[PDB]
Amino acid sequence: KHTFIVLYVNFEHRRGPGKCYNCRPAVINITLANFNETKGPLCVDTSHFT
Amino acid sequence: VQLVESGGGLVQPGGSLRLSCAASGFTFSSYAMSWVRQAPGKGLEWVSAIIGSGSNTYYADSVKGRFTISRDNAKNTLYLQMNSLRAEDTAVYYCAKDTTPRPLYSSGWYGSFDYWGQGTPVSV
Amino acid sequence: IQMTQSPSSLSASVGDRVTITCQASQDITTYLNWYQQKPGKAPKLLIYDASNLETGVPSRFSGSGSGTDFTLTISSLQPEDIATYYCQQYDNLFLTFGGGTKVEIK
Numbered sequence: 544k545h546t547f548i549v550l551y552v553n554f555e556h557r558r559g560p561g562k563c564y565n566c567r568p569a570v571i572n573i574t575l576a577n578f579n580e581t582k583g584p585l586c587v588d589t590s591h592f593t
Numbered sequence: 594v595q596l597v598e599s600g601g602g603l604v605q606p607g608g609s610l611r612l613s614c615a616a617s618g619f620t621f622s623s624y625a626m627s628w629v630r631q632a633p634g635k636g637l638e639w640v641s642a643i644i645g646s647g648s649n650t651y652y653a654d655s656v657k658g659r660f661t662i663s664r665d666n667a668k669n670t671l672y673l674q675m676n677s678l679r680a681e682d683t684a685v686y687y688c689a690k691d692t693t694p695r696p697l698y699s700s701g702w703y704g705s706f707d708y709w710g711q712g713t714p715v716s717v
Numbered sequence: 718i719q720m721t722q723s724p725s726s727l728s729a730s731v732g733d734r735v736t737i738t739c740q741a742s743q744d745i746t747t748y749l750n751w752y753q754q755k756p757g758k759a760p761k762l763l764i765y766d767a768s769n770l771e772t773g774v775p776s777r778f779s780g781s782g783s784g785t786d787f788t789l790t791i792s793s794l795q796p797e798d799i800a801t802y803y804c805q806q807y808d809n810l811f812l813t814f815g816g817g818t819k820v821e822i823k
């Protein structure tokens with residue numbers, strides 16, 4: 544069986560009066576597909592994974 | 594950062610061509626690259642694109658299912674497989690480089706091309 | 718997604734403060750960039766993210782916009798500025814170019 548451990552990263556600058564670019568990003572998207580903290584860690588159980 | 598193309602010519606509609614574009618002066622596998630053509634008297638229309646690792650390929654609707662995009666990271670070369678060329682494909686083609694470097698293990702966005710080649714026209 | 722550039726053609730003289738706009742027909746937020754196209758030559762990048770001046774371009778260019786409208790301004794026209802301009806979005810992988818525009822001498 545094959546399990547896909549996909550990690551998504553996305554971020555953007557805070558939209559506002561300042562069009563700064565070299566600044567650190569303010570909003571952060573980090574997801575781990577079917578990961579859901581209330582349920583617990585996502586552990587791979589199939590023989591093959593990527 | 595020099596880009597040079599080849600494979601221009603005239604073929605009867607319905608044939609096939611092997612377009613090419615070589616790159617040098619930067620880490621070839623770190624940047625996504627795309628093919629774009631300009632029809633005589635018209636603007637720029639996007640043909641196809643590929644990620645630095647070559648894992649993902651993209652095509653426009655009018656270009657969909659008709660051609661295949663490929664790249665070879667070992668030789669710093671780009672290839673466009675022309676197949677079943679219709680009359681509307683008569684234009685000049687350009688290979689461009691995306692400005693954002695991405696890790697080889699990552700599939701990411703593109704769009705802000707910064708460097709272009711010389712160009713290679715074709716006729717059908 | 719499709720974009721319209723207006724006007725398609727205009728003529729101006731040296732020192733004129735030329736202003737040009739293109740519409741995105743969709744919320745693009747900030748994913749727009751402008752290009753330089755001297756006919757008979759391949760294009761070159763002018764401004765990315767609709768507001769950043771590329772390191773290889775003189776400071777006489779500026780741009781701004783958000784949402785669906787976007788603008789490009791030239792502080793003062795110089796004799797080499799006579800060339801085709803182009804806006805293109807990257808808010809979707811199926812990126813598209815604008816309708817095109819040409820500046821002319823006067």
Ligand SMILES: *[C@@H]1O[C@H](CO)[C@@H](O[C@@H]2O[C@H](CO)[C@@H](O[C@@H]3O[C@H](CO)[C@@H](O)[C@H](O)[C@@H]3O)[C@H](O)[C@H]2NC(C)=O)[C@H](O)[C@H]1NC(C)=O
Nearest residue numbers: 549550551552553554555570571572573574575576577578
């Ligand atoms: C943070 O980024 C994540 C990236 O995963 C965003 O999740 C994505 O949100 C969009 C909009 O809800 C989802 O698009 C649609 O999802 C349905 C799901 O069945 C699908 O049928 C549609 O075709 C379309 O794809 C997207 O799939 C979803 N991705 C995942 C992996 O969950 C999230 O919205 C972002 N949040 C913020 C506040 O920026």
Ligand SMILES: *[C@@H]1O[C@H](CO)[C@@H](O)[C@H](O)[C@H]1NC(C)=O
Nearest residue numbers: 576577578579580581582583
């Ligand atoms: C997933 O996490 C949410 C919180 O984001 C929680 O409310 C929900 O119950 C969890 N899903 C399941 C199916 O238990």
